[model samples]
Target chain A: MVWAIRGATTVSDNTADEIVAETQKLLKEMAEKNGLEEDDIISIIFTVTKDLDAAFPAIAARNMGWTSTALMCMNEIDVPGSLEKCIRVMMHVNTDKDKKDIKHVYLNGAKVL
Target chain B: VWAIRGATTVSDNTADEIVAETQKLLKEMAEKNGLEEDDIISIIFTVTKDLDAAFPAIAARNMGWTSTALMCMNEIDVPGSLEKCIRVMMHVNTDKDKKDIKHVYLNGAKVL
Candidate 1:
């Protein structure tokens, strides 16, 4: 079985350090809440609001030892009045757990989403 | 075993080219993987910033994916990266191993 774990977090500033730090925080919580390990992840796609472009969010996952996971980065759709400075990720992972057992994470400013 | 990656580049940003190229890519992905529409969980599309005339999800819908979940977003704005390109990450329920699954890259995106 597989599951898509959605998570999002906002950065206070558009700096490389801030981007990676907040993104890592979101990814870490996504994993911890779901009880997932690196090998369980099939792939992860990350998207950032247009306002935040200091760095690719994939860097945070790589630093977390997900080097072998298929990671991709993109920009979220620019819908007017949408969340800003937000980083969103959809992580596809192999798991036996039921779909209802999966946890979706939202932190910081994105928690309102 | 779950996710299939595919991409194809179009010559222009017109709706016709985007839909055609994406449909071609989607067809090849399904054929090569022996996929059935019901087996798919979601289809994620990402196009380069240069393409905005149409959503690639339109291609999937035209190809009879009425109930399938689809999403569209902008590809990462990497400098000197491929342009006029559409990429897909299709997550499906399949018994095949990851190594056994076939990934498709067609048209200009074949360079990848």
Candidate 2:
């Protein structure tokens, strides 16, 4: 079976490092919690709120050793009032776990998930 | 197989317009890839930078995919990006390979 791992984390600053670091943290935690290997991922899609244009979260993951995964980045819908500097990702991976057993990771200001 | 990508655009930005347009693409995608509710790993939809009339997943929910994992996103606002577009990326579990899995890109979306 294939499973989707959904997660989010926010950055406090608009710098490139902060953007990647927070996203990296979220990705690492998700892998740890879900027992996922980098090779297990089929593809990853990342979205950032409009305000944070400093970097692509996909590049952040790549920098953190996710080069094997197919990755893409996008802008998240800019709701009039929503959390700022937020980065969200959905990872599709080949796994045996059912949807109920999948672990979702949401960190920092993205607790709303 | 793995994942299939589908996209279509609405002529207008109303919730009604989006749902009407979005519903067809998903229905067609389901038909093309031989997918079911449980075969669906996730459905992530992205609205082009200009529109936010309603979440595109509303269209899928309307089609009775009540328990599927659905996500909404913003397509990165870049130069020459498609306008008034709704893009769907669905992950499904099947033994078919990527080349055999048909990807649907409708309307003005030209890039693969």
Candidate 3:
């Protein structure tokens, strides 16, 4: 079976360091909390709020040594009253676990999502 | 264990065009790939920078996909890339091999 886990985090600023750091933290939590390994990941889709254009969140996964995973990045839809400086991720993984068993993580100010 | 890809282009960035083209693209993908609501894990949609009048996920909701997980965002604006295009990647739980999946690219997006 296949399952997807959702996670989001906010960056203090748009610097590459801040974005990469916060994104790495969120990705790590999502993987560890859900018992995910590098090989189990199928693809990861990332989106950042328009306020963040300094870097791509996908870089965090690559820095973590996820060489072969399918990774894509995009700009989050700019809604009128949405979170700012936020990076969101939806990770698709090949797993035997049921949907109910999946864990979704929301860190920092991104908890509202 | 499958991710089906599909895309279509719109004549303009109007809300009607975005919704209509997106609905057409997803319908073709579902039919070609033999997808069911239960087989779907999640769907991620991206639109060209020029096309953002409406969310493509609206079309899926209109098609009665109430329970399916859907997300929308703007595609990275690569220089000289296709314009007014809506793309989708649907992850599904299926027994079919990767080569068995069908990918649909309609209208102007056929060039991709």
Candidate 4:
């Protein structure tokens, strides 16, 4: 079945170190919570708010050893009044798991939801 | 069926004004070629390493997009790549023949 696992984290400010660190933390937790190994992930898409330009968050995944996974990055829509300094990811995995069983991860400032 | 179309343009510089203009150009090209609207299945947007503060898709949604599913992310890190730009590839569900779909690349990005 087609399902989406949402994970996000916010940095205190826009810096490569902070963005990568928070992204790595969120992805690691998402993998564990969803019982996903790197191989299980079909592809991943990452979006960063307009304010964060220091580096691509995918670097964090690569740094964390997500080699060979299909990954891409893009600009998040600049919706007024939306969250700021936020990095969001949608992980698509091949699974026999039900939709309800999927775990969506939101970290750091994004956990406010 | 699913197919990909892309379009991009450079801005005079960083500023909301430039982004909005470039995004508008890309989206217009994408729509004219694909013959669809907010009904697009999904869209993925990417920008140059220099463009860090704004996600272009957010601007598209702000311009009256409803059913278009979208995500944003960064481009590959090739040494000395193009700078201060944005790109997009859209996957859409349509009855149009696959061969008929145009993959658009605009601005100085046309060389790729």
Candidate 5:
């Protein structure tokens, strides 16, 4: 079975280091909580709020040794009154666990999602 | 493990049209990819920046996909990319090889 774990985090600044660390932080926790093997992941898709442009979230995953996982990046909608400087992730992993058994995580200013 | 891709565009920005087109895209993708609601792990949707009539997630919810994980966001505005289109990436569990996966790109997004 495959499980999808959703997560997001907010960056205080739009710098490359901030975006990269936030992405890495959230993904690291999601993988650890779910007991995920980097090879077991089918894909990971990321989206950043409009104000963020210094880096793509995919870069952080690759830096974390997810070099072979299919990864893509996009821009989150510019919805009015929405959270700012947020980066969201949807990760698909081939796991033996059931859907409801998986854990979804939200960090920093992303708990609202 | 499989990741199926699909996309469709609406002629205008209306809640009904966006939902309808998104539903159509999902149906076609499911048919081609041989997937059911139970087989889906999650679906990530990215709409063109100009498409905010309604969330594309509404289509899946209305199609009885109540338990599947669904998310909707905006596509990156990469200069002159296509507009008003809804793109989907559906992750599913299967024994099928990745090369055998059928990616359905329909409507105005067929060129992608």
Candidate 6:
């Protein structure tokens, strides 16, 4: 079966380096918390609101040794009045875990998820 | 099998317009390229240098999209990339040929 784990992080400002560093930290924590190996990820989908344009979060994961993971990035639907400076990701992995067992991580002000 | 194709556009400078226009264009191209709403496995989204007052995913869901997976993020700084733009790449399950996949890049991004 396939399952998804969601994780997120926020940056103080919009900058490429900041986005990259924060993304790395978030992915590492997610992998450790979920017992995930780089090869275990089938694909990772990353999205950001309009406020963030510093960098592509997937690049941070790749730089941190996620070479085997297929990754892509996009824009979140722009709703009037939503969170800003947010970087969100959904990782799909082929695992035996049920959807209910997956842990979705939200950091900074995004912990509501 | 699945593949990635990006489509983007600039609004007349507003959150709602940017989200609605870019998404509509991207999905139109995605559908034209042999994608049905249910066939979309997942989507990833990002925005440019300026313009971040809303969550594009919420707008998408409000547009009657349910079940398909989604996420959001920021983009890379490549010196002089487009600004005030929203971008997306969709991973889809289809029997169509990979070479035949059409990538939709529109609006101010249409020139690229």
DockQ-based class of model 5: acceptable
fnat, candidate 5? Answer: 0.39
True-contact fraction per candidate equals 0.38, 0.54, 0.37, 0.14, 0.39, 0.32
State every prediction's TM-score relative to the real structure: 0.74, 0.73, 0.73, 0.57, 0.72, 0.60
lDDT by residue (A1-113, candidate 5, tens digit) is 66787888999999999999999999999999999879889888888888999998898888889898899887776665678899989887788888868888889998975
> By TM-score, highest first, what's the ranking?
1, 2, 3, 5, 6, 4
Candidate 1 lDDT: 0.88
User: By DockQ, who's the top model here?
Assistant: 2
Using lDDT, give the best candidate's number.
Answer: 1
Candidate 3 has a DockQ of 0.32
lDDT of 3 at B73: 82
DockQ of each: 0.32, 0.43, 0.32, 0.12, 0.38, 0.19
Off by over 4 Å in 4: B1-81, B84-112
Writing each residue's lDDT as its tens digit, candidate 4 over B57-111 gives 7766676665687766666443445666676766555665444556666776676
Give model 4's docking category: incorrect
Pairs with steric clashes in candidate 1: none
For model 5, the local distance difference test gives 0.85
* Model 4 lDDT tens row, A1-113: 44668898899987879989999999999899988876566557788887887878888889988765556676677788888989999887756789989999988889875
lDDT (tens digit, per residue) of candidate 1 on B1-112:
4678898999988999999999999999999999989989889899988999999999999999999999888888755678998999988888887667787888888897
Quality of model 3 by C-alpha lDDT: 0.86
Off by over 4 Å in 1: A1-3, A62-83, A96-113, B61-67, B76-81, B107-112
Residue B87 in model 1: lDDT: 92
The order by descending lDDT is 1, 3, 5, 2, 6, 4
TM-score of 2: 0.73
Q: Which digits, one per residue and each the tens of the lDDT, describe model 5 over residues B1-112? A: 6789898888998889989999999999888878888888888888887877787888998899866777788786787888779999888877789998988887889878
Shift in Å, residue B98, candidate 6: 0.6
Q: Which docking band does candidate 1 fall into?
A: acceptable
| Candidate 2 deviant stretches above 4 angstroms | A59-67, B2-5, B31-34, B61-83, B95-112
